[PDB]
A paper describes a structure:
The [name] β-lactamase model system has been extensively used to study protein evolution. β-lactamases are a class of enzymes that are produced by bacteria in order to provide resistance to bactericidal β-lactam antibiotics through hydrolysis of their core β-lactam ring. We apply EVcouplings to computationally design variants of the model protein [name] β-lactamase. Aligning these structures in 3D to a published WT [name] structure (PDB: 1XPB34) revealed that all three have nearly identical Cα backbones to WT [name] (0.26–0.61 Å RMSD over all Cα atoms).
Most notably, the 70.a design, which contains 88 mutations relative to WT [name], had a ~32-fold increased MIC of the monobactam β-lactam antibiotic aztreonam, a 16-fold increased MIC of ceftazidime, an 8-fold increased MIC of cefazolin, and a 4-fold increased MIC of cephalothin. All of the designs that enabled resistance to ampicillin in the biological assays had a similar catalytic efficiency (kcat/KM) to WT [name]. This includes the 70.a design with 84 amino acid differences relative to any known protein. The G251W mutation, which was present in both 70.a and opt.b, stood out due to multiple studies that describe it as negatively impacting fitness in WT TEM-125,51. However, the other functional designs contain amino acid changes that exhibit fitness defects in WT [name]; 80.a has two amino acid changes that show fitness defects, 80.b has four, 70.a has 11 and opt.b has 28. To investigate the structural basis for the increased Tm (80.a had a 24 °C increase relative to WT [name], 80.b had a 18 °C increase, and 70.a had a 6.3 °C increase), we tallied the total number of hydrogen bonds and the number of atom pairs in contact (1.7–4 Å) in each structure. There are five shared mutations near the active site that are in three designs (M69A, E104T, P167T, E168A, E240G) that may contribute to this increased resistance.
Numbering used by the authors: 27 to 51, 54 to 286
């Protein structure tokens, strides 16, 4: 345990509810509040990309299909999608944008490709996830009012789902290596896991920030000469600053390397 004491202390010190799940890909198990629901924030974007890649694999979608869009469609935080109001972007470029930059319009453009939030939930069930749901678009989905089940996962379901997508058989080998490559190229989660992550280890991750103090991260990590580990760490319902909240998720992720 003792990684258990750190989580319990973080809840008591920060007034937060924490969810942690780790999956060793192994014959090991654990988790803290791992079947409670947490707001996904921008970690859902890994799932929407896997959803879209699954449609490509079925011949139902084209990664090179160009989406042309307008500026009333831009939602706050569009670091990439704003620079391409003129030419548009391909679906592949959009996927890259949401995983790499957490660009919110690219996410919405992918959700629209899939058929909306209700359709991502249907993919998730199709790949075995009975709990995780997406219900809104960016940025409404980060509202995270406590007790609301919209736009939620559980640490157990999210760790399981990421495994089925990244290492399981839900996606093609080409799609997995695309998603993994995007996650290894993530740029907005720096200190939460990567920073305390030893050199020589590979991490692909995706992080979320959301209202009511929501902070989340999902990650596949390859220790040196070991099977990958899937981690899902969520924190919410706290009034701490983004600083103490970042430092606790990093402190939980550090304890996991032990």
């Amino acid at each position: 345990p003792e990684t258990l004491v750190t989580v319990r202390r973080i809840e008591a010190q920060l007034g937060a509810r924490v969810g942690v799940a780790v999956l060793d890909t192994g014959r090991s198990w654990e988790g803290y509040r791992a079947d409670e629901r947490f707001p996904m924030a921008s970690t859902f974007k890994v799932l929407a990309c896997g959803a879209l890649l699954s449609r490509v694999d079925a011949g139902q979608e084209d990664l090179d299909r160009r989406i042309r869009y307008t500026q009333d469609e831009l939602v706050t935080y569009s670091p990439v999608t704003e620079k391409h109001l003129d030419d548009g972007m391909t679906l592949r470029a959009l996927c890259e944008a949401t995983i790499t930059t957490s660009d919110n319009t690219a996410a919405n453009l992918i959700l629209e490709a899939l058929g909306g939030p209700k359709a991502l939930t249907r993919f998730l069930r199709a790949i075995g996830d009975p709990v995780t749901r997406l219900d809104r678009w960016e940025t409404a989905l980060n509202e995270a009012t406590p007790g609301d089940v919209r736009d939620t996962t559980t640490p157990r379901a999210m760790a399981a789902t990421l495994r089925t997508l990244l290492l399981g058989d839900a996606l093609t080998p080409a799609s997995r290596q695309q998603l993994i490559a995007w996650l290894e190229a993530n740029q907005v989660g720096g200190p939460l896991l990567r920073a305390g992550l030893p050199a020589g280890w590979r991490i692909g991750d995706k992080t979320g920030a959301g209202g009511r103090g929501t902070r989340g991260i999902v990650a596949i990590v390859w220790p040196p000469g070991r099977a990958p580990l899937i981690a899902a760490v969520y924190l919410t319902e706290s009034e701490a600053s983004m600083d103490e909240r970042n430092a606790a998720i990093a402190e939980i992720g550090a304890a996991l390397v032990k």
